[PDB]
Amino acid sequence: MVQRIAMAPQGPEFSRFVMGYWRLMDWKMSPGELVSFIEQHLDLGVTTVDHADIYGDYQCEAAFGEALKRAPHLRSRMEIVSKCGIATRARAENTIGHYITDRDHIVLSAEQSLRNLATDHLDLLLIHRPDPLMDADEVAEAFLALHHSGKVRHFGVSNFTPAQFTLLQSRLPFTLATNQVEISPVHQPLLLDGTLDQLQQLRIRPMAWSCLGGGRLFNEECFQALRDELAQVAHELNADSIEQVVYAWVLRLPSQPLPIIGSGKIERVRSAIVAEKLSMTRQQWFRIRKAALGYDVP
Numbered sequence: 001m002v003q004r005i006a007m008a009p010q011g012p013e014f015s016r017f018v019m020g021y022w023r024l025m026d027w028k029m030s031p032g033e034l035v036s037f038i039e040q041h042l043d044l045g046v047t048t049v050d051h052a053d054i055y056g057d058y059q060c061e062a063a064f065g066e067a068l069k070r071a072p073h074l075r076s077r078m079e080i081v082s083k084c085g086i087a088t089r090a091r092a093e094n095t096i097g098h099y100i101t102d103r104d105h106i107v108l109s110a111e112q113s114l115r116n117l118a119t120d121h122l123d124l125l126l127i128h129r130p131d132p133l134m135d136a137d138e139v140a141e142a143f144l145a146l147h148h149s150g151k152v153r154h155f156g157v158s159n160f161t162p163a164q165f166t167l168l169q170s171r172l173p174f175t176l177a178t179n180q181v182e183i184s185p186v187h188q189p190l191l192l193d194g195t196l197d198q199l200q201q202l203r204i205r206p207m208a209w210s211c212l213g214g215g216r217l218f219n220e221e222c223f224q225a226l227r228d229e230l231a232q233v234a235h236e237l238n239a240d241s242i243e244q245v246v247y248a249w250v251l252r253l254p255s256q257p258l259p260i261i262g263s264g265k266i267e268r269v270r271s272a273i274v275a276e277k278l279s280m281t282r283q284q285w286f287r288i289r290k291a292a293l294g295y296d297v298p
């Protein structure tokens with residue numbers, strides 16, 4: 001089944017592919033359909049699932065929780081990731097989109113995540129975005145309260161620069177387990193700006209979001225050349241689709257990213273993880289890179 005990967009030295013073990021529930025409300029599944037969807041991706045070996053407090057106007061967590069109430073035995077088969085730190089205008093009290101990373105909000109957000117998800121613990125809690133008002137001492141207090149109470153097993157960040165990563169890690173007695181960042185052929189600046197250098201150096205694995213550009217891979221005109229090349233490499237690799245080749249292109253990176261699947265169709269989920277079997281050459285990798293960017297490596 002899907003490869004298991006240690007997220008950090010003595011960190012949690014995740015599935016190499018993650019099921020992301022950003023778009024859960026868009027799928028318009030009944031709780032029973034969601035149970036079946038979860039059961040099927042667990043059976044494929046997709047055990048790690050990705051959430052945030054804000055997703056679906058603060059509804060995805062609770063909808064996922066309706067499934068876990070229906071089939072509580074499923075909790076022991078999965079690793080739950082959720083996030084906090086963002087405040088959207090979906091809440092009436094928020095007249096602007098902003099960030100909240102104070103201690104009490106982090107503790108209370110995770111506690112609310114537990115109630116929404118119908119579970120007694122999170123495997124991993126992320127700070128969702130770097131915040132110019134983040135006091136690392138206060139986040140550290142919140143993490144220890146959550147870890148010491150057994151409510152959260154591991155902690156991480158998302159979309160952090162290396163300086164922001166290092167700032168927070170300096171306050172923590174345990175290793176941050178991921179920096180969940182955007183990695184795709186259509187979005188590559190983290191390959192060179194130091195983010196993926198730091199993660200490889202520390203042996204911390206990134207969860208990778210919008211690996212398909214949130215759909216932009218299929219629909220934006222300026223990626224016609226990328227689609228053509230992915231099709232040619234798919235033919236060479238006997239892959240089933242261009243997205244399988246994209247997933248192989250992400251999996252090839254030496255930080256060993258974990259692609260997060262965003263599709264609500266279990267057949268796309270099933271097809272995505274076939275990417276593990278592909279044997280992409282370096283030249284195929286650099287051919288795909290050039291097709292996306294338009295220019296050669298220096």
Ligand SMILES: NC(=O)c1ccc[n+]([C@@H]2O[C@H](COP(=O)([O-])OP(=O)(O)OC[C@H]3O[C@@H](n4cnc5c(N)ncnc54)[C@H](OP(=O)(O)O)[C@@H]3O)[C@@H](O)[C@H]2O)c1
Nearest residue numbers: 020021022050158209210211212213214215260262263264
């Ligand atoms: N930490 C962060 O800041 C952050 C930000 C964004 C996302 N994320 C996480 O990353 C996960 C994945 O992000 P994402 O949802 O944008 O993933 P993605 O794979 O890049 O985009 C998924 C979108 O593309 C569609 N899709 C898949 N295959 C397609 C195909 N052959 N043709 C046309 N459309 C296709 C999907 O719709 P269908 O369901 O119809 O297949 C879905 O709408 C999210 O669930 C979330 O957990 C994190």
